[PDB]
Structure 1
Amino acid sequence: APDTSVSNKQNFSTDVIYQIFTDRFSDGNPANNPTGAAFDGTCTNLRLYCGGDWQGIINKINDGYLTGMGVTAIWISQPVENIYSIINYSGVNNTAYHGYWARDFKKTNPAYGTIADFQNLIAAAHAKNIKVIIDFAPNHTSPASSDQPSFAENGRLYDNGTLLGGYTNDTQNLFHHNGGTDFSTTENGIYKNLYDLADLNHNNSTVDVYLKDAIKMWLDLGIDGIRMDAVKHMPFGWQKSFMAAVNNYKPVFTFGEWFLGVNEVSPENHKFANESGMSLLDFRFAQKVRQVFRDNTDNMYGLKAMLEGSAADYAQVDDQVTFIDNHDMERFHASNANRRKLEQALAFTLTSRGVPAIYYGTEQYMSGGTDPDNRARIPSFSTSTTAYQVIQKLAPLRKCNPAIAYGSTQERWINNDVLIYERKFGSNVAVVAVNRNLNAPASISGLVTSLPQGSYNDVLGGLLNGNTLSVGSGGAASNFTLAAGGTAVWQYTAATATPTIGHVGPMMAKPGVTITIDGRGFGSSKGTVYFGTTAVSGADITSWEDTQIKVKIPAVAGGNYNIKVANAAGTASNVYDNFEVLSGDQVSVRFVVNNATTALGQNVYLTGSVSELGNWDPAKAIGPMYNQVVYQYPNWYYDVSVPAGKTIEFKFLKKQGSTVTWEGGSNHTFTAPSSGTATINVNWQP
């Protein structure tokens, strides 16, 4: 099936996500509405239940509200069973309408619907070529207090009705007991409570395995994607082990939430996206897009810098989920502002690299402050709005223009208020022009594109004051005027003859697993897939076609491989890099090293006899290690994803820049658990 098919649970670059706050969408079944001080059918008290449900979603998917827009994917609130208790935060009643207060990951939220309802949601959606993504919060349970076990539900965690444990009198040690985080450091925000939410301890085999079993359930229920919540609050190593659990069973596009603020650029965030095995929500993109189009605290030059930079920082920039606003920030549209800003940002997002995601109600010009004002009920299902139309015209492009989906980005013209960029993939091209300046037109001369000779009509049909473009020879465009607040989209598509790889997923897995390779010019006959120098052909290639290839991962050694393909004729494609071949099934292990003294600016890393440990390469060593919460300096620790049941030789090192200092004596040894977790305590050898 084409790379565009709804069945492609491995690629979302051609889709348009629609983020839905289930409760605030549509009440298709009032019989499941909560009651009492937890319910409010008017939806004035934004901290209560409003009635929104899966049934409602189905109806909207059925009357054409979503399909009409061009939406091809929906991200819904956490489906699992949340607490029932109505919490009181200073005279104000709060409920788990949001779904981020997990009680039992093996059951659904009655308010949203039954398992049967969820199954109906999947079918209705699938039938309408719409993919389903679900929010998942394995970082915690609910708001708790060890002192007052009467507070809410003591963060109680169940396993399909069976009570595992609570926050108070936590003998099993399921949760963390290190206080709350101040967001001071990564390690601080990972091992301490996020707010007052009962932090789960992933180092406990019970929790580990449990969450592993849970996710399978949902996977078996037909989901198409996963949205990992609070990923910067969970151990990277564990997450890696969790991802492999997914990829080694039922691969699905996964992206986590790594909150970033204005002008914030984290390297820890980059490395996560590149090694974790999952992608992330483009906060970088979102924040900059806001300064530029919203608050006007930066200009086009800042927009260009972001694009270029990101493309260099992320190994797979096209896997990043872009957005302009969400349930955690003020709605992009201000009650007094010009709507043209919101439309512009929308156009920009839809035609940019990554995976566009739209927070429900945007198309309706919903204004609102922070939580919970940004979570109002969808006021209307009108397709007459300008925003609704923009989405409607541009959305489909991601499907018919590989340039938009997998294309590169290039500034072709720029200035303080104007930005013209070129998306390009194979014989496909897209050129977009934006003029934020709402009061001044811009004269565009010297514009050069990759557009074939001829005239081009604005894809937006002048909806946003766009215009016609005249491209002479050499891609040189004729002089034109870019109206105030103008936005134009010109394009050119053609059949690609050369094999061009645009996507690959999953991005991490063990031998035997089937991976998906999408692109153009693959031909109709089976060819060859190269995993490094290892060639693959024949039966192992489950399926081959012009835009997609399904091939089983060869039994090569664990490590990082380069993926290339060649058609029947023998013509080779571009080289897709950064694919990780796991050594086998994964298990999360905690490494601890005692008496490891360092100098200010010098850190301790780990290395070993397996690819998951860098293979003895100081440049690929795990770290830097932690030393301040679970263990204090000179005692370091770290949660690492290693191959289960394997015998590993390891060592630690102190790294100062590129300068490496090896541990002395012989190599440490240990045999990884064939399931669940373990802790390795060792002393530094001099």
Structure 2
Amino acid sequence: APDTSVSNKQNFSTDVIYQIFTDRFSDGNPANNPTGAAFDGTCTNLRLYCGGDWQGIINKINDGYLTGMGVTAIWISQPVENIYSIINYSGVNNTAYHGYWARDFKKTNPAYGTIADFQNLIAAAHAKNIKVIIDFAPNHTSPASSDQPSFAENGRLYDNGTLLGGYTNDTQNLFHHNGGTDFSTTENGIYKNLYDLADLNHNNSTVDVYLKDAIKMWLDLGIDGIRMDAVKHMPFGWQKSFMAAVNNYKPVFTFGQWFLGVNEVSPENHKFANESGMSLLDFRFAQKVRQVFRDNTDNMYGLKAMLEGSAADYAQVDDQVTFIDNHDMERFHASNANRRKLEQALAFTLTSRGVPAIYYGTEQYMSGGTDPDNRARIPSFSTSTTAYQVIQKLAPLRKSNPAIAYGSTQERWINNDVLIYERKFGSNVAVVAVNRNLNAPASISGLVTSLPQGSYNDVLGGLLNGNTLSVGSGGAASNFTLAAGGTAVWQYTAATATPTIGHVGPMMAKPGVTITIDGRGFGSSKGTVYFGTTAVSGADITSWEDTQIKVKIPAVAGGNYNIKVANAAGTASNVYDNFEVLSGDQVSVRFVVNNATTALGQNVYLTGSVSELGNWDPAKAIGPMYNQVVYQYPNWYYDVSVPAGKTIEFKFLKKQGSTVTWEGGSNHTFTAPSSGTATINVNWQP
């Protein structure tokens, strides 16, 4: 199959995701609607169920609404059974219409549908070349009160109907009892409750095993990807182990929700996207886009800096899920704003690197403030809006033009208000011009591109006041006027002669697992795949075609490897780096070191005899470790993904910058569990 196929669960870069708030999209089966105080068929009361369900999505898939727009993937509300309680918050009734208050990760939310309905949804979507991503929120269950078990459902966790336990009388320690977070530190936000949400204890073997088994159920149902809720709120090491469970079973494109505020650039966030085994929702991109096109708090230079910085910061920038708004922020379009702002932001997003996600109703100019105002029922299914047409014209380019899906990004022309950028991949090019100034045109002269000589019609057809481009030899464009609020797209596509890797997924797994290498120019005959210096050819290459290769990871030692391919003729491709070969199946283990004193700015890290611990390389050590919540300084702790059942030697380090202080004495040793979790507690050796 080609890279663009709906069957490709490892790569969404050629797709356009449509984020559906299930309850607010389409009620295709009124018979499953909740009732009484929990329901509002008119959807006036935005905190109650409105009736939107899976049957509704199926209908919209079948009637051309989504397909006509060029949408090729949907991200739906968490499908698992949520609490049925109607919570009264300061005199206001609240329900689980949003799907984020889970009670049983092994059952469906009856309001959305039955398991059968889910299967039908998967089937209907696939039939229309639409991939299905489910939201998944393993950070917590639901609202709870320890000293008020009568409140809500006490955050009770069920296993396919079987009660595991609740927040109250949590003798099992299924949950964290560390209070609530103020978001003051990453550690604080991980080990304390988000609001009043019962925080699941990922260090508890039952919880750990249960969650991994639960996801497996969904994978078996045929999902194509996962949107992980609150990834900044769960132990990173645990999440890595979770991603390993997924990848070592049935890998699917996974992206996490890690909020970034205006102007926030987080190295920790970069590291997570780079080493967790999952990518992230691109808040950096979204926030910058809002500043530039919506709020006027930054200009094109800021947009350019975000593009350049992000491309360097994220090992796989093409895996970051971009967006302009979502259910947790005010809608992009302000009721009184010029619609062109929204249209441009959309055009920008659709033609930029990563994986674009469109919040349902954006195309209908929905406006709305903070939750729940940003979750109204979609008011229309009109294909006639300018925004709908913008998506319709641009979304498909992700499939037809690999420069858009996998290309580099280069600024070609810029000023406060104008940005002209170029996407390039193989013999494919796309040039996008955006003039955010709604009142002033710009005179574009000196524009140089990689486009072949000739005249280029705006892909947008002048929809956003774009114009035709005239390119001479050398790629120089003739002078032109970029209209006020103008947005234009010019492209060129052709067969690529040389093997070129545009994407690899998953990026982390154990030997034997099949990975997908996508791109162009691979040729039709089986070639060679390289993992670092190791060559793979023949049988282990399951399938090979011009745009896609399926190959089993060789039994190399755990570590980080650069991927490269060569066609049957021996011509090598570019290198796709950062591939992580795991040492085997993973388990989440908590490491605790006592009496490790440090000076301000100096932190404790973990190192050891397996690639998962950085193979004794301080530059690859695990940390910095925590020392506030679960354990207190001078004691430090950290949850780490390690190879199951392996005997591992390790030591702790004290690092300040790249300066390292090693624990004295001999290495510590332990044998990782075969399944579930474990806690290894030792003392710092001077």
TM-score, normalising length from structure 2?
A: 1.00
Q: Give the Å deviation of 1:349.
A: 0.3
Question: In structure 1, what is the equivalent of residue 551 of structure 2?
Answer: 551
Quote the Cα distance in structure 2 between the aligned partners of 1:392 and 1:658: 50
Quote the Cα distance in structure 1 between the aligned partners of 2:480 and 2:238: 55
The superposition leaves residues 540-583 of structure 1 with CA deviations (integer Å, 9 ceiling, x where unpaired) of: 11000000000011011000011111111011111110000000
The superposition leaves residues 35-94 of structure 1 with CA deviations (integer Å, 9 ceiling, x where unpaired) of: 110011000000000000000000000110000000000000000000001000000000
Quote the Cα distance in structure 2 between the aligned partners of 1:443 and 1:144: 60
Quote the Cα distance in structure 2 between the aligned partners of 1:600 and 1:43: 53
Query: Is 1:469 the counterpart of 2:435 in the alignment?
Result: no
Q: Give the Å deviation of 1:420.
A: 0.2
Q: Give the Å deviation of 1:657.
A: 1.3
Quote the Cα distance in structure 2 between the aligned partners of 1:305 and 1:632: 40
Quote the Cα distance in structure 2 between the aligned partners of 1:79 and 1:20: 12
Quote the Cα distance in structure 1 between the aligned partners of 2:25 and 2:576: 40
Quote the Cα distance in structure 1 between the aligned partners of 2:382 and 2:532: 52
Question: In structure 2, what is the equivalent of residue 158 of structure 1?
Answer: 158
Quote the Cα distance in structure 1 between the aligned partners of 2:294 and 2:663: 53
Q: Give the Å deviation of 1:454.
A: 0.7
SS at match of 2:635: strand
SS at match of 1:326: coil
Quote the Cα distance in structure 1 between the aligned partners of 2:682 and 2:453: 68
The superposition leaves residues 625-664 of structure 1 with CA deviations (integer Å, 9 ceiling, x where unpaired) of: 0000000000000000000100000000101111111101
Query: Is 1:318 the counterpart of 2:318 in the alignment?
Result: yes
The superposition leaves residues 134-164 of structure 1 with CA deviations (integer Å, 9 ceiling, x where unpaired) of: 0000000000010110000000000011100
SS at match of 2:408: coil
SS at match of 2:597: coil
SS at match of 1:409: strand
SS at match of 1:563: strand
Quote the Cα distance in structure 2 between the aligned partners of 1:668 and 1:441: 67
Quote the Cα distance in structure 2 between the aligned partners of 1:250 and 1:650: 31
Query: Is 1:344 the counterpart of 2:338 in the alignment?
Result: no
Q: Give the Å deviation of 1:310.
A: 0.2
SS at match of 2:409: coil
Quote the Cα distance in structure 2 between the aligned partners of 1:651 and 1:63: 60
Quote the Cα distance in structure 2 between the aligned partners of 1:166 and 1:223: 29
Structure 2 unaligned spans of 5+: none
Q: Give the Å deviation of 1:475.
A: 0.7
The superposition leaves residues 120-145 of structure 1 with CA deviations (integer Å, 9 ceiling, x where unpaired) of: 00000000000000000000000001
138-147 vs 652-661, which moves further: 652-661
Quote the Cα distance in structure 1 between the aligned partners of 2:497 and 2:545: 13
Question: In structure 1, what is the equivalent of residue 395 of structure 2?
Answer: 395
SS at match of 2:490: strand
The superposition leaves residues 83-116 of structure 1 with CA deviations (integer Å, 9 ceiling, x where unpaired) of: 0010000000000000000000000000000000
Q: Give the Å deviation of 1:506.
A: 0.5
Quote the Cα distance in structure 2 between the aligned partners of 1:541 and 1:179: 51
Structure 1 unaligned spans of 5+: none
Quote the Cα distance in structure 2 between the aligned partners of 1:273 and 1:119: 31
Question: In structure 2, what is the equivalent of residue 169 of structure 1?
Answer: 169
The superposition leaves residues 199-248 of structure 1 with CA deviations (integer Å, 9 ceiling, x where unpaired) of: 00000000000001000000000000000000000000000000000000
Q: Give the Å deviation of 1:532.
A: 1.0
Quote the Cα distance in structure 2 between the aligned partners of 1:155 and 1:168: 9
Q: Give the Å deviation of 1:473.
A: 1.5
Aligned residue pairs, count: 686
Quote the Cα distance in structure 2 between the aligned partners of 1:309 and 1:203: 35
Quote the Cα distance in structure 2 between the aligned partners of 1:149 and 1:287: 39
Quote the Cα distance in structure 1 between the aligned partners of 2:285 and 2:659: 34
Quote the Cα distance in structure 2 between the aligned partners of 1:189 and 1:425: 40
Quote the Cα distance in structure 2 between the aligned partners of 1:21 and 1:659: 48
Quote the Cα distance in structure 2 between the aligned partners of 1:423 and 1:507: 23
SS at match of 1:633: coil
SS at match of 2:216: helix
SS at match of 1:121: helix
Quote the Cα distance in structure 1 between the aligned partners of 2:460 and 2:357: 20
Quote the Cα distance in structure 2 between the aligned partners of 1:45 and 1:602: 51
Q: Give the Å deviation of 1:341.
A: 0.4
SS at match of 1:497: coil
The superposition leaves residues 148-206 of structure 1 with CA deviations (integer Å, 9 ceiling, x where unpaired) of: 10000000000011100000111000000010000000000000000100000000000
The superposition leaves residues 295-344 of structure 1 with CA deviations (integer Å, 9 ceiling, x where unpaired) of: 10110010000000000100000000000000000000011111000000
Quote the Cα distance in structure 2 between the aligned partners of 1:302 and 1:511: 42
Question: In structure 1, what is the equivalent of residue 523 of structure 2?
Answer: 523
Quote the Cα distance in structure 1 between the aligned partners of 2:548 and 2:321: 22
The superposition leaves residues 444-502 of structure 1 with CA deviations (integer Å, 9 ceiling, x where unpaired) of: 11100011111000000001100011111211110010110000000000100100001
Quote the Cα distance in structure 1 between the aligned partners of 2:171 and 2:329: 38
Aligned-pair RMSD on alpha carbons? 0.4
Question: In structure 2, what is the equivalent of residue 215 of structure 1?
Answer: 215
TM-score, normalising length from structure 1?
A: 1.00
Quote the Cα distance in structure 1 between the aligned partners of 2:472 and 2:538: 47
Quote the Cα distance in structure 1 between the aligned partners of 2:297 and 2:525: 53
Quote the Cα distance in structure 1 between the aligned partners of 2:265 and 2:577: 24
Quote the Cα distance in structure 2 between the aligned partners of 1:571 and 1:513: 25
Which consecutive aligned stretches of 4+ in structure 1 deviate over 3 angstroms post-superposition?
none
Q: Give the Å deviation of 1:621.
A: 0.4
Question: In structure 1, what is the equivalent of residue 137 of structure 2?
Answer: 137
Q: Give the Å deviation of 1:526.
A: 0.6
Quote the Cα distance in structure 2 between the aligned partners of 1:665 and 1:381: 69
Q: Give the Å deviation of 1:269.
A: 0.2
Question: In structure 2, what is the equivalent of residue 431 of structure 1?
Answer: 431
Quote the Cα distance in structure 1 between the aligned partners of 2:75 and 2:30: 22
SS at match of 2:186: coil
